[PDB]
Nucleic acid binder design. Structure first.
Ligand SMILES: [Mg+2]
Ligand SMILES: [Mg+2]
Ligand SMILES: [Mg+2]
Ligand SMILES: [Mg+2]
Ligand SMILES: [Mg+2]
Ligand SMILES: [Mg+2]
Ligand SMILES: [Mg+2]
Ligand SMILES: [Mg+2]
Ligand SMILES: [Mg+2]
Ligand SMILES: [Mg+2]
Ligand SMILES: [Mg+2]
Ligand SMILES: [Mg+2]
Ligand SMILES: [Mg+2]
Ligand SMILES: [Mg+2]
Ligand SMILES: [Mg+2]
Ligand SMILES: [Mg+2]
Ligand SMILES: [Mg+2]
Ligand SMILES: [Mg+2]
Ligand SMILES: [Mg+2]
Ligand SMILES: [Mg+2]
Ligand SMILES: [Mg+2]
Ligand SMILES: [Mg+2]
Ligand SMILES: [Mg+2]
Ligand SMILES: [Mg+2]
Ligand SMILES: [Mg+2]
Ligand SMILES: [Mg+2]
Ligand SMILES: [Mg+2]
Lengths: 75, 95, 87, 245, 85, 110, 288, 97
RNA sequence: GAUAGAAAUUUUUAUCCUGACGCUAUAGAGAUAGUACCGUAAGGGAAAGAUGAAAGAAUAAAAGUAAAAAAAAGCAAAGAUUACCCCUUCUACCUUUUGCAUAAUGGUUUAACCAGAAAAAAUCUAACAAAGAGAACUUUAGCUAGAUACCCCGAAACCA
């Protein structure tokens, strides 16, 4: 199932097999799948961090098109 | 003085200049004479006169005062009834 | 080279999406509607009767206007008590 | 004939009307030009002023350098104040330091925008025109109907008339330019083709010859002359006025 | 760079997309509109306009709510609309 | 701006005199203001330097300089100081002659 | 014309390549480099100034600051609420009729004075209108209908002598605005509101035939007006007998902003069409 | 101070390329065009800087008040800090007081 | 006091038309990487690439040295000379100070980095002018525009 871990990433949770029901399980119950309040900050930063990389990838490729077109006067 | 405001970027004015002075349009700055409400009985009638006066501020003081004062108090003003409107211009000044 | 088309100010009525989240709320106000009538208003397809106050707006304007701005006769009578008291 | 009154003490100007169909039709006619536009006292002063104002006022330089605040890291005193026996420093991003901040430098997107006052820009176009005329390099045309879309025809036409290297062709509106002009010129570097709404000083000086259509001149003369006779605007002129559009 | 949309609007368009989009419309509507809670701790002045005693002119006067924090236990009982100041 | 109403009587109550039907033959001319007033103004510098500026002059200003200073010289006993700006089409003179120059350009009917 | 012109036949092309701005236009900036302007760069030596921190402007070095020793005073006191009236001299008025900016033929109120650019009103700055003065008193030959917010005796006199009618009318801040720059108010596209009544203190000024106040009883108009002549010694003209009479008579409601229009209306200037309410509550509102 | 040994390929620039020939074309648009659009609208740039000018402090405080809430966290931070610094520096320092 | 600082009420035309009087390997992002490395940890945090189509073809210009160790004398040079010295004549340089050859400070040397920003008032140039400004303002020659202006490094602390 799609779940949300403590780090604010949304993850694909691979399931597991247990001899007992989940609410009777120690180790399962002390796992936290959910975000707490403060994490919301980092989430944004992640976005932003990521958002820059796309931003300057584009801006590079655009450049590579000028250079070539001024190195090679086609047509 | 605040030469640049926070929110407007403008040049702020000092209020405590304004509460005690008056600017004519000639640039002459007008003021009370200090201590005129102060210890009257102890004073000679002559002094009392000299104090109850309104007086003028020398160039230094004026320029200083202008710096602490924005455009808006330097604008021209026509008040109805104005006691001081009689005064605002300069006459016969040959320098 | 031939020049670009000269930049023109479109003279048609112009209405933003009311439901677009990014569109400003100053362009979504009643006043903007009024203004748009003023500009063209025939073509702007603005409901004319809306350019006047509602019954609520009307009765409130009424309430405040009779509140802070008395009658001429009433102001003269407000002045007679003063003048006679000072006499 | 001029569509507008000349002042009493001042006689108009006259320019040959050339047409564009034959190489060999040079003076097809004669036009009276208004003295207050094309005879104005030449002032290179304002030419200069506005020429600059053209260059700059559009300019936004995006150059940002990073202050000692905006550099990566170095939020700390590298070593202690005393006893090391070397020069004291704060962060390694002190501008003194190699990879550290830049003291002053450029800042951010930065705009130079200023409005040369109205009647000034106006009188600038005035002067530019007067000059293009007085230096003999202004050529009025009627028509602009072109015999053909072959650009060599145009180049060679400028050749037969000793027009010099470059040319700016001015027409009344964007829609009404005949198709042979558009065709032949859009494939040319030196010649240019523009609606008279985009007539401008910089370009006027940038082209060794100015060429004006008759409806264009009758238009210009008016639009510029409007301004010696005009009030100071109350509100924006784009708004309704008594006389004014 | 910038964001395509301001972040104050991030929690709303949070709702326009995904599972919230199949939510009952009446629900979202009772959620959108925030009525201004009853004055409890602060005491309101009646009029929109009130004369300045010092200055002697009519003055536009507005009423600012007072921040009131609710301990988690507040949500467990019925506190009648009040809480910590 | 309205072209000012032709009257039966000149000068008018406020003192406005139209320029003539012909213009003089003096080898210079003075455009009236966009208000049809004579372009003679007064201006100061540093608060103490008094000046008088004649504007909008088309022709040889040098001549105008001759005639102006020769008009003023009986008044001051000495030629008044002059700065001619040929490119500006403008004349400048030390002191306030505003009133007298107004008249003197009503004389020649500019 | 400008023989300068014929000097340009001689010279090479004016182009970008050759341009000098007017001498003394650019006064060149200098930079603290070199032997002269480097080394302390006109900042002095040490102390406070060299480090850029010298104290704020009003400061005396701790001696009680000049501007602060002096006692406060009612001066600029309530300066915001003191009414202002932009003056208009008669000389300026004669001027403006003379060059036919404002024409005497049709009525004259503030709006017209504005459109001739003869006066400038900034209502936001507590300007309550134009007021009249006597400067061209003897100069004044014109027969005119004038409506101002304030006028002085001598002024009223100098218009009477020539046979015009002066009325003192008041405008509130808002209505005054609407008055001065009316076209942009229309383009606002809001109805045309009721006019305020003058405040209480002002009431006595506008109820006097003494001032020919617009709210005054017309029964005293012929009286006090004739009185004006005996004081200033001239024969009072008969206005009722004149051709231009019906314009001079022309008044406003105390509720009317303009000439010919009415509270509640709305102007569509695109369709060149006026709009009036047929609803009753509205008419009771704006006609009251 | 070691300087470049070999001549660079001389950069050839046609000043007759499109953008340079067409420079400043619509500049007079308001005037010649019976003003509707202002020269301003010929300005293509950063949202807050169109048809406006100011010293650093004003620029910054402007970018903030306009695009502020659309900025990234970190840039924003640096912006508030630059603002503060500038406040302190323009008001509180100088030779000229 | 320092400073703080509103609102009523007003203004705002479409998209289209992307770039660069931005950097070029100490610059430009920390970044060839959050890598080595440094911290128990939170945390800090680098430096470096260069031949040519083809390697499926093998400039000699910084300090520093070497070619060439030194010859009675002395801020090292200068005036000079037939002649390198020999002769004669001159208290390194910055900062700092009343005053420094000072036995006061700083510095091995080379290279690259490395520090003056603001427009109230004022002047200067100009437009138009009882008016001027492309709205809002200011005016008893004035308004409008332009041009002219106010650095760099450093504590001990302080709060989270
Ligand atoms: Mg830091
Ligand atoms: Mg620290
Ligand atoms: Mg530190
Ligand atoms: Mg680095
Ligand atoms: Mg760096
Ligand atoms: Mg002056
Ligand atoms: Mg020095
Ligand atoms: Mg020092
Ligand atoms: Mg000292
Ligand atoms: Mg005023
Ligand atoms: Mg700056
Ligand atoms: Mg792009
Ligand atoms: Mg690097
Ligand atoms: Mg070597
Ligand atoms: Mg020796
Ligand atoms: Mg010594
Ligand atoms: Mg000592
Ligand atoms: Mg000593
Ligand atoms: Mg010693
Ligand atoms: Mg020693
Ligand atoms: Mg020692
Ligand atoms: Mg030593
Ligand atoms: Mg020491
Ligand atoms: Mg030292
Ligand atoms: Mg040492
Ligand atoms: Mg200034
Ligand atoms: Mg500088």
């Amino acid at each position: 199932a799609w779940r949300r871990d403590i780090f604010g990433r949304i993850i694909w949770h691979k399931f597991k097999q247990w001899p007992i029901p989940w609410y009777l399980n120690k180790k399962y119950n002390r796992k936290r799948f959910f975000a707490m309040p403060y994490v919301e900050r980092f989430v944004r930063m992640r976005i932003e961090k990521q958002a820059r990389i796309k931003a300057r990838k584009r801006s590079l490729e655009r450049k590579k098109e000028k250079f070539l077109q001024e190195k090679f006067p086609h047509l | 003085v605040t030469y640049f405001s926070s929110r407007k970027g403008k040049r702020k004015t000092v209020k405590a200049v304004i509460y005690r002075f008056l600017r004519l349009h000639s640039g002459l700055w007008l003021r009370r004479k200090a201590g005129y409400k102060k210890k009257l009985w102890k004073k000679t009638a002559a002094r009392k006169r000299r104090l109850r006066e309104f007086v003028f501020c020398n160039k230094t003081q004026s320029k200083l005062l202008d710096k602490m004062t924005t455009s808006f108090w330097k604008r021209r003003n026509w008040y109805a009834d104005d006691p001081y409107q009689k005064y605002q211009d300069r006459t016969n000044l040959k320098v | 080279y031939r020049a670009r088309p000269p930049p023109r100010r479109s003279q048609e009525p112009r209405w933003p999406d009311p439901d677009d989240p990014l569109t400003p709320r100053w362009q979504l106000s009643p006043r903007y509607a009024a203004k748009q009538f003023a500009r063209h208003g025939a073509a702007s397809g603005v409901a004319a009767g809306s350019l006047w106050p509602s019954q609520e707006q009307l009765r409130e304007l009424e309430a405040e206007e009779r509140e802070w701005y008395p009658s001429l006769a009433a102001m003269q009578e407000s002045l007679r008590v003063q003048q006679l008291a000072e006499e | 004939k001029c569509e507008l009154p000349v002042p009493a003490h001042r006689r108009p100007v006259q320019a040959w009307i050339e047409s564009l169909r034959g190489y060999e039709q040079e003076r097809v006619g004669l036009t009276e030009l208004h003295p207050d536009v094309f005879s104005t006292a030449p002032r290179l002063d304002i030419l200069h002023q506005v020429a600059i104002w053209q260059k700059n006022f559009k300019r936004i330089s995006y150059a940002k350098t990073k202050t000692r605040a905006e550099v990566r890291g170095g939020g700390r005193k590298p070593w202690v104040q005393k006893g090391s026996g070397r020069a004291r420093h704060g962060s390694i991003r002190s501008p003194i330091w190699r990879g550290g901040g830049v003291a002053h430098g450029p800042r951010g997107p930065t705009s130079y925008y200023y409005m040369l006052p109205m009647k000034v820009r106006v009188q600038g176009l005035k002067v530019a025109l007067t000059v293009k005329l007085a230096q003999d390099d202004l050529h009025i045309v009627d028509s602009l109907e072109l015999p053909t879309a072959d650009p060599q025809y145009l180049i060679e036409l400028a050749r037969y008339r000793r027009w010099g290297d470059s040319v700016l062709l001015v027409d009344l509106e964007h829609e009404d330019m005949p198709q042979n002009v558009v065709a032949a010129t859009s494939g040319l570097k030196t010649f240019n083709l523009v609606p008279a709404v985009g007539l401008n000083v910089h370009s006027m000086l940038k082209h060794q010859t100015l060429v004006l259509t008759l409806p264009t001149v009758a238009f210009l003369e008016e639009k510029l002359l409007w301004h010696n006779s005009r009030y100071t605007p109350l509100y924006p002129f784009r708004l309704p006025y008594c006389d004014f559009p | 760079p910038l964001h395509k949309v301001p972040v104050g609007l991030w929690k709303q368009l949070r709702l326009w997309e995904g599972i919230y989009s199949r939510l009952p419309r009446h629900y979202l509507r009772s959620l959108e509109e925030a009525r201004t809670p009853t004055p409890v701790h602060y005491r309101p002045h009646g009029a929109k306009f009130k004369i300045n005693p010092k200055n002697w002119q009519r003055e536009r006067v507005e009423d600012v709510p007072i921040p009131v924090h609710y301990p988690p236990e507040s949500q467990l009982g019925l506190w009648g609309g009040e809480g910590w100041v | 701006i309205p072209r000012p109403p032709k009257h039966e009587h000149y000068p008018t109550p406020s003192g406005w005199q139209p320029p003539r039907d012909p213009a003089p033959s003096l080898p210079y001319f003075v455009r009236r203001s966009r208000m049809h007033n004579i372009p003679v103004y007064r201006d100061i510098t540093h608060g103490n330097r008094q000046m008088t500026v004649i504007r909008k002059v088309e022709g040889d200003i040098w001549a105008l300089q001759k005639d102006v200073e020769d008009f003023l010289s009986p008044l001051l006993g000495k030629t008044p100081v002059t700065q001619v700006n040929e490119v500006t089409g403008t004349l400048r003179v030390k002191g306030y002659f505003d009133q007298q120059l107004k008249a003197w350009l009503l004389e020649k009917g500019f | 014309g400008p023989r300068a012109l014929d000097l340009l036949r001689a010279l090479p092309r004016v182009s970008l390549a050759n341009l000098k701005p007017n001498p003394g236009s650019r006064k060149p900036e200098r930079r603290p480099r070199g032997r002269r302007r480097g080394r302390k760069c006109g900042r002095g030596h040490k102390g406070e100034r060299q480090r850029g921190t010298r104290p704020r402007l009003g400061f005396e070095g701790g001696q009680t600051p000049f501007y602060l020793r002096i006692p406060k005073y009612g001066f600029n006191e309530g300066h915001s609420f003191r009414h202002q009236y932009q003056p208009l001299s008669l000389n300026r008025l004669q001027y403006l009729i003379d060059l036919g900016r404002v024409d005497p033929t049709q009525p004259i109120d503030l709006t017209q004075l504005v459109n001739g650019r003869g006066v400038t009103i900034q209502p936001s700055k507590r300007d309550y209108g134009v007021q009249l003065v006597e400067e061209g008193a003897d100069t004044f030959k014109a027969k005119v209908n004038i409506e101002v917010q304030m006028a002085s005796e001598l002024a009223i006199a100098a218009i009477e002598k020539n046979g015009g009618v002066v009325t003192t009318a008041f405008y509130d801040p808002r209505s005054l605005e609407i008055l001065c720059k009316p076209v942009p108010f229309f383009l606002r596209g809001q109805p045309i509101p009721k006019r305020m009544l003058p405040p209480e203190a002002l009431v006595p000024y506008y109820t006097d035939a003494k001032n020919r106040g617009y709210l005054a009883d017309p029964a005293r108009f012929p009286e006090a007006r004739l009185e004006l002549a005996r004081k200033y010694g001239y024969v009072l003209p008969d206005i009722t007998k004149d051709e231009l009479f019906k314009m001079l008579s022309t008044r406003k409601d105390p509720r009317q902003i303009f000439f010919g229009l009415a509270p509640g209306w709305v102007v569509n200037m695109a369709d060149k069409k006026i709009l009036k309410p047929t609803d009753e509550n509205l008419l009771k509102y704006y006609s009251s | 101070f070691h300087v470049r040994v070999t001549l660079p390929p001389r950069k050839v620039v046609d000043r007759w390329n499109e953008k340079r020939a067409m420079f400043g074309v619509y500049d007079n648009i308001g005037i010649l065009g019976n003003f509707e659009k202002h020269p301003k609208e010929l300005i293509k740039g950063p949202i807050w800087l169109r048809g406006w000018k100011g010293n650093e402090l004003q620029r910054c405080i402007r970018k903030k008040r306009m695009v502020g809430n659309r900025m990234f966290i970190d840039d924003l931070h640096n912006l508030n800090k630059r603002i503060s610094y500038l406040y302190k520096h323009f008001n509180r320092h100088g030779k000229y007081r």
